[PDB]
Structure 1
Amino acid sequence: TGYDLSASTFSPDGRVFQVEYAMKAVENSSTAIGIRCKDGVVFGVEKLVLSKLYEEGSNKRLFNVDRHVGMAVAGLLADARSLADIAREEASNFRSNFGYNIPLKHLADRVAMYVHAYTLYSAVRPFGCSFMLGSYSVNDGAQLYMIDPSGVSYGYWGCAIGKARQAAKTEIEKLQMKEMTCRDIVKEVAKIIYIVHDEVKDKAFELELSWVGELTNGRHEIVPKDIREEAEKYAKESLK
């Protein structure tokens, strides 16, 4: 047990062992992957759904951070909701003060500052969630940043969080993610989500896709997979 009781006392060995419980908490939640295509970022998140007593789209884990900034989370859902509200507050503050759109790098670093500050005070605890932010500024390119419960903000060409981070990352690694366009990337993401334990032991779940991209006009949208369900057909074809 040592001194691993609060995230403000430096435990035996430099590792606090307090936030390394928040990483375990993030490990509990289901997987959530994200891929930066040529013109946009595709957020593919699986949310485990007990079809019993559900609402076919309740408590979805995709949220809007900004008119152009989309996000995905893994871990505690309440912390995700609160920090999505915080990110919306930060984006609105930048929008009102600077008179133009917030760069994704600055938003990501400020949210990471919020997370890191919450990791420190004794009276508060680090968030039990890790998340991944995407945006496209038509002026210069596309931006993506993944932040952990410790507050480490790093970029990824493609990333994953949740219960299958390394498996999903290995699946992403063989994608020709250098050049292709987000349209086929949606199907790639769907089949990658399904290949890693779609419903093998857990009964049922739902797949949600978020999309920011130049062809999507650059704003943040939920991919309307209702059209021909091509990614869903691909994911179920991934059966073998």
Structure 2
Amino acid sequence: TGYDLSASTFSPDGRVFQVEYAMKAVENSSTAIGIRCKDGVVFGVEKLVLSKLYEEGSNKRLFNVDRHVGMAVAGLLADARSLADIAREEASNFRSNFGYNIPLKHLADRVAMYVHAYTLYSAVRPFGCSFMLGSYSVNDGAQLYMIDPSGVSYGYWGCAIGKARQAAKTEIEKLQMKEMTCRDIVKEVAKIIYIVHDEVKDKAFELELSWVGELTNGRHEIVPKDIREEAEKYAKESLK
């Protein structure tokens, strides 16, 4: 006892338990994945509807930090909105100061040093949020970064965050990043977001998809989920 309470105390085996408890706090939240193609970044978040709870489009875990950068948060939600406001403000500082649009590398550093900066004191608690960062610029290419509650930021071609995490990142190695256009990769996400999280746990669900890349011309926005409706047209035909 006594080694798990505060964040600033090492445990005798040599790890920090508040950080380890922060890692598996995101483990209870629902699955949200991401993947990049050769010219764009595709997001997808499965969202939970039990009976009535909310109007369609409530508390969307897809955010929009800059003109060309977006979030895909999973875990506890309020601190994820706090990181959305802080990363928003950091893109405002870089945009105001140095005159050009923020690269995804500096944004990953300046956010990840804050997420780390709340794991050094017993003033605060470590965050309980993990989020994706997708972007595209013609002098940059599509990058996809992944920030955990511990503060580690690095780069995937594809990732997954949630309960069904390993099962939802098992199948991504079947897909090919290098050749595919992202317009395929939309339904190529929605097929396994429909496949993972089988409906015995929760009766119903609802899907969000957000898509930035070359076709949207740098601007990040949600795809019109009604428009082309490619998800469930493949997904009801993907059970057999």
- How far, CA to CA, are the matches of 2:198 and 2:71 in structure 1? 22
- How far, CA to CA, are the matches of 1:70 and 1:232 in structure 2? 24
Matched position secondary structure for 2:177? coil
Deviations 1:145-179 (A, max 9, x none): 10100000010011111112211111111112222
Cα 1:201–1:75, aligned 2, differ >3 Å: closer, same or farther?
same
Preserved contact between residue 70 and residue 211 of structure 1 (Cα < 8 Å): no
- Counterpart in 1 of 2:187? 187
Deviations 1:83-119 (A, max 9, x none): 1111101111110011110100110111100100011
Aligned-pair identity (%) = 100
Segments of 4+ moved more than 3 angstroms: none
Matched position secondary structure for 2:209? strand
Cα 1:6–1:236, aligned 2, differ >3 Å: closer, same or farther?
farther
Q: CA deviation at 1:2?
A: 4.3
Q: CA deviation at 1:140?
A: 2.9
Q: CA deviation at 1:201?
A: 1.7
Preserved contact between residue 2 and residue 11 of structure 1 (Cα < 8 Å): no
Deviations 1:33-81 (A, max 9, x none): 0010111100100111234132011111111111100111110011111
- How far, CA to CA, are the matches of 2:228 and 2:42 in structure 1? 18
Between stretches 23-32 and 203-212, larger displacement belongs to: 203-212
Preserved contact between residue 50 and residue 202 of structure 2 (Cα < 8 Å): no
- Counterpart in 2 of 1:90? 90
Between stretches 93-102 and 159-168, larger displacement belongs to: 159-168
Preserved contact between residue 135 and residue 143 of structure 2 (Cα < 8 Å): yes
Q: CA deviation at 1:227?
A: 1.4
- Counterpart in 1 of 2:203? 203
Between stretches 193-202 and 60-69, larger displacement belongs to: 193-202
Preserved contact between residue 2 and residue 12 of structure 1 (Cα < 8 Å): no
Q: CA deviation at 1:232?
A: 2.3
Q: CA deviation at 1:11?
A: 1.7
Preserved contact between residue 40 and residue 182 of structure 1 (Cα < 8 Å): yes
Between stretches 91-100 and 191-200, larger displacement belongs to: 191-200
Give the alignment's TM-score, normalised by structure 2. 0.96
Any gaps of 5 or more consecutive residues in structure 1?
none
Q: CA deviation at 1:225?
A: 2.1
Q: CA deviation at 1:184?
A: 0.7
